[model samples]
Target: SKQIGLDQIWDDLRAGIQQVYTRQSMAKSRYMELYTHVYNYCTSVHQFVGLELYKRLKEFLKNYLTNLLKDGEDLMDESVLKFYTQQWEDYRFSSKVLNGICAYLNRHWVRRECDEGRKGIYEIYSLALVTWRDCLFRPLNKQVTNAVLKLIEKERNGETINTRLISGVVQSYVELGLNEDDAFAKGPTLTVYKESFESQFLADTERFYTRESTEFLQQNPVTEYMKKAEARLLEEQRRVQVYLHESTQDELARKCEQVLIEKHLEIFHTEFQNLLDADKNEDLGRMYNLVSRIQDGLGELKKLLETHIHNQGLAAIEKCGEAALNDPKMYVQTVLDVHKKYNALVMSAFNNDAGFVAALDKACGRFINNNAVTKMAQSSSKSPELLARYCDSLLKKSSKNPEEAELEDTLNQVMVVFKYIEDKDVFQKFYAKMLAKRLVHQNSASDDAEASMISKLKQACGFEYTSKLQRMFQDIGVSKDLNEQFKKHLTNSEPLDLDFSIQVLSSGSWPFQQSCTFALPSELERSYQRFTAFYASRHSGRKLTWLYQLSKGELVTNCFKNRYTLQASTFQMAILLQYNTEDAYTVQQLTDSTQIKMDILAQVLQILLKSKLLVLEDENANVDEVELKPDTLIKLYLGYKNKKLRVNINVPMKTEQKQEQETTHKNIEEDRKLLIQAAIVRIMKMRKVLKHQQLLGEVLTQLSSRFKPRVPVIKKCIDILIEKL
Candidate 1:
């Protein structure tokens, strides 16, 4: 065969490159004919032929694509972009075929030239891409990036644009991208698609969204701004999947968030209150999602939400101040309503983030503690007393508004507020007082509910905190057993004139008033002596103190001209027993004969006066004086009337306000000393030796579970411990 010359092979290679570009198929025989001549030159002594052919191919692609893009420089930007996209597609296809025709040169002369540090020769495909990048794209780099971003801006502005043309042009940037590090690699490790196209595209995106977000926040509602922002982000992500490189998705989305969500974070700051005021949960959640993409984004939202809740709560407290004092139930109900509403908001709007939950608690605590100590230096908070009364309403069987079945839930709700009280010990004091009344009166709605509430308190505080409360329950249980055993022992004996039952309560476990003495009537006196004898015989060394002030009895009296069983206080019955011996007696005579105090005698006589069962000789008399006058006379009324056969005309005992206040005040002081000593001992015991400030902190943490102690109080207690040691 005649040896093929370089001139014919080069001519045929150019024709094949054109065929691939122009959409015409080159024959397999023709392709192999070009390949054989190139291969022979590459393997022959004149390897210079392959080197010269590599140079010629590089020149052909460079000039061919440069002229290709130059033709579209005069067209409209979109048209230019479309032409550039089509030329890049044609060049890529043409380069692949042309590179195959020169494959022998790539394997031999191109590798030899690269190893020998010879310039002007490259791997077949790499040469084609580099030629386009350095010659074609370098001149029009600015124009192409500008054209692509402008189209994106158009789409962003909600106008129709050619997505296909932009996507094609962007793909060309990726294809033409190359660097020295990518010489032996399968593909470009670093692409102009990212550095050139994506970088500029991202810059334009930041500027565009920044400007749009500012304008949107000023002119549109925040909700509308958020909606548009969310849509823009979705559009950008879709643009990545379509036109931009897939790797740019996160980076592009981040830029958008910075400009649209983070840069305009103040808009959310200003409008979060509005969203909360309107209870626009969806809008708030949208704000949370957008802002959560940036650092400390949720933190800003959480702070603003907390401030709003605190302000609103303080307003509610101030508004209900009068009601809190006059009608505690209404005040507590309003407080509970506020807590529930914001708690629900945190769950639904803030996604129940722990940070927001902490904020909610902080806000509530501020207002609740403020209300409790609104007046400074009150020994105990009145709020706890009111809260105990609220609990009483729910727990007492005699409650007009009974919530018997919902007791557990009601107690749980009460705990939500109870957790905020600065002095939990104050609540225990009032609650224990109320519990005593309920247990003694047999008024608790459910024994299980009482136990359940105590159990909950135990969980919140600890076993030590609920110890006394548990003892109160135990005392009641033991009292019931004692009463049963006493009645059983008396069953064998002849029954007394009056059927009597007694509850023997342990002294320290039960809440009691100061002891008072009164003479018992004949029948009750006889039965009481027997019970005293029976109790003494059963127990070796126990003393019983009769609480005549708290005791009650029945009297069959004919003062109304009909037989009536009247329930009376022990003092009242004592006064009435005088009526059986005489039709009338002076107040002095009743006091003397009953052996009751004059003040006590007067209060008991008043119940008779109020019920009209007994009348004073002077008809317009006031018998309930602090002290009874000696000359005052009384007489039984013959006209007492009632709607029921069993009349309970007993007057309730009035609390001595001065005595109770002194006792409570003394108890509070003693408790403070005890609690302070306990806290100091506990801290010193655990830490062994601690600095003053650290000891204060640990003590405060320990005491905060029950009460907030003042710094001075804790400090003094610490001094006492040091001195003792």
Candidate 2:
């Protein structure tokens, strides 16, 4: 019993037995030889030794007794069992022989069992508890200061290391040391604590814990759990990569789905949460690295993310901002960052797949639901300074770094985003600011793209926004060339470049072709009013120039107003003014309203009709009555045709001569001719439905002029007017 308590003696017995069993020649005596031979029979022969006498004895020392001696866990074979048994016997015998020697050594050092028990081990235990507890858990001397800091933090926080565990461990250590005076004499408890260890670890320490944990694993093998986790992480990463790089939406989606099915659902969610958490502090550089990796992976997976709904939602969000969305620069960095997570899976390629759609809806819905984002830019007037400064910044950045690829890609991405933005007006406003900036610095490739994009954006600028863009456009260099073309085209002095654009301001067109032909003299007086309106609409307040190739610029007409009346002979002015007079009767009414001389009226109508802007109207009461519709289109067409006919009068074509000669007849024939011409020109003037009574009255007065008699002339004019009608 006493032999088992001493570790040195037990270890010595085991060591000797092992050597004797392994090497028979190493044994020096019969006792060693006998056990060695027994080991050979039991182990070498594989005999059933469980119930055998020799086997029992051998196993007693080898397994049972050895467990109590060294606290190890292993099933030793019979060879070791028998050899250890003999050593134990020898040890027992030798201890008996050395009893006196041991007694002599114990008297000086080892306490007698009686004496050791007589004194209260409780005092030993209590002292040891105090000393060891202070020694063990107190931070090591080197870590003392930092350990104190931890304690202070714990004190303020009210939570830290367990004082009770420390106290118990320290008490156990001190008690094991027997609370000797020597242990207490060490000044600090830690000094004695260090010396408390007998040996660092047992001889078979590795095997001991293996058995302990083996038992644990038998209950729960965390190793297998960890292995499964590692496998899933790798598998998911691989799937994501294949999806992103290949742009293969279908296969990537299928593989991802397969992974989801194969892997635990909660595990996948947990992994996603883990990844998102890990990314919280990632900077732009880190994000880019991740994106590149995802791209590489997606390339392998067929680029599934190319059309992924996640990107669509994001692109829509950006595009809703329109020009703001077109601004790839402002948000390009963020787009790249988000790409890292979805790209490896090649979300775009898989966007149509149900899983991708589901994920995208869940992932991007948060951004859309919140009102934090806007679809477009704000109006400059609403925040002019901000827009101006923002424009300046974009221009400056674009100029400083003329990287077109980034800008182009970004613009494309942004356009995608803007498509989803709901507030279109806001986006237009925002886009205007960006467009204005790009137009300012539109030399670089990026800026050119921006300017071109702005031009496209004009289509989005409804009536309300177009004026703003036009105004802004005027400030940019792009409009400088436009103004020159505008002047050249409006003046008619220079031929416009047809290649550039269709001449919207061309003469002979709707606004430029004059509709009313006042007599030269009347035209002079009304020219200013007429041309002022013309110039105002066409060239704003700018001066207008008129040139004829036939006259070569020598007759370069620079009339600001229709001063033809002022320039005309005084007699022409007087005759023309007669149309404005109340006493002057219309040809039909010269018979009634007019008392003025017909000669002057004839002179004025001739001059007015020659101008092509006025013509005559006739309605026959007899002869075949030609029905005509009286609508704006017919009126305008008549006026337009009359203007053309007037232009032909300069050359006197047969039709023109006939029209003029037909009017020369002295009786009802001449009246009918005058009435017809009057109806045509007057209709032309009235087509636009503006003010033109003066020219009409002049034509009527011209008709009433050729009567020979005076008092009866009114009666005859009435008969003629009725006949012509």
* Per-candidate clash tally: 0, 89
Compose the digit string of candidate 2's lDDT tens values, residues 1-725: 11123334334444654454343464358555544543443332212221242233345434533343343224432222233334334544443332322123223322432465523322332332333234322322223223323433343234644343223333333333343444346433333433432111111222333343345445753334334334443543453353222223344334433332222333323433343434432221222222232222323122232234354446644543544333434443443345445543433334344544455445543343232133233211222222223333444443356456765665454444433333344345445544543443342334466555555444543455455655555534334565565566557754332212211222221112232222232433444354455457756433343321111000111121231212243333333344443322245343122232343334334444455323334311211232212210100012233212112222223443465334322322433444444444444344433234553444345433221123333334434454443
Lowest summed lDDT across 10 adjacent residues in model 2 is found at: 548-557
Local accuracy of candidate 1 as per-residue lDDT tens digits, 1-725: 34566677678756755665677665678667756765665354225576676567667766776676577677565566776777777777767776665554445444466664454344344677777777877878887778777778888878998688877886777766565654666755545677787777777888877777787788888888889889888988887888677778888878877787777777678888787788878888888888877886677777788889988877876776555665657867878989999999889877988999999999898777665335433534666656777887777666264555565666788998998878777677777887887887687767777788888989988887688888878877877898887667667767556566678776766667566555566766677777778778787555564577667768787667667898877777667776786878887776677788765666666666777777776666655543347877778787766777888876454644455667766766766676667755676666666666776676677656677778877667667777653
Which number leads on lDDT?
A: 1
Taking every candidate in turn, the Cα RMSD to the unseen true structure, in Å, is 3.5, 29.2
The superposed Cα distance between candidate 2 and the true structure at residue 282, in angstroms, equals: 19
Instruction: Name the candidate that leads on TM-score.
Output: 1
lDDT comparing candidate 1 with the true structure? 0.72
Candidate 2: segments with Cα more than 4 A from true spot: 1-272, 279-332, 339-354, 368-399, 433-447, 451-482, 485-725
